[PDB]
């Protein structure tokens, strides 16, 4: 079984990590140093608990397997949005949930943010409003 193979691998990976004294964050950083693709402590945690989708585990397994084999021998950084800035965006959302591209650019300029971050903030916020009904 593919699912059972992922279960057994996650277990073997976790055991070897712990046997060597690595934290989850350590091994995520190690994978960036050695193979150029760092992952967060959060992701390592989810992988070891099988709290990722099937496709997602199948994607990461060969990367984690490179480190395990040694042990047995690209995305942009997540932008932090200040509380007062988030509240400014939220109050705008309440009366204009879908600003135009021009307005998005103006908001970014006024708030000293990147236009793409503001664009994506509104996209995600619309999706949230759907999720929470």
């Amino acid at each position: 079984s593919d699912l059972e193979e992922l279960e057994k691998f996650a277990k073997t990976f976790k055991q070897r990590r712990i046997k060597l004294g690595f934290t989850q964050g350590d091994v995520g950083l190690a994978m960036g140093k050695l193979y150029g693709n760092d992952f967060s402590q959060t992701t390592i945690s989810r992988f070891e608990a099988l709290n990722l989708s099937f496709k997602n585990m199948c994607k990461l397994k060969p990367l984690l397997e490179k480190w395990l084999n040694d042990a047995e021998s690209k995305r942009k950084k997540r932008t932090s949005i200040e509380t007062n800035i988030r509240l400014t965006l939220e109050k705008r959302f309440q009366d204009n949930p879908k600003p135009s591209s021009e307005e998005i650019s103006m908001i970014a300029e006024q708030l000293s943010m990147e236009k793409e971050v503001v664009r994506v903030w509104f996209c995600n916020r619309r999706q949230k409003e759907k999720r929470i009904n």
Binding site: R46, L52, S53, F54, N56
Partner: peptide, 22 residues
């Protein structure tokens, strides 16, 4: 009370439990 953020759908953990149940 409502979950605010995005959740993974169909984790391997859940799929394994679903398979082992039937």
């Amino acid at each position: 009370r409502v979950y605010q953020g995005v959740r993974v759908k169909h984790t391997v953990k859940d799929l394994l439990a679903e398979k082992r149940s039937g």
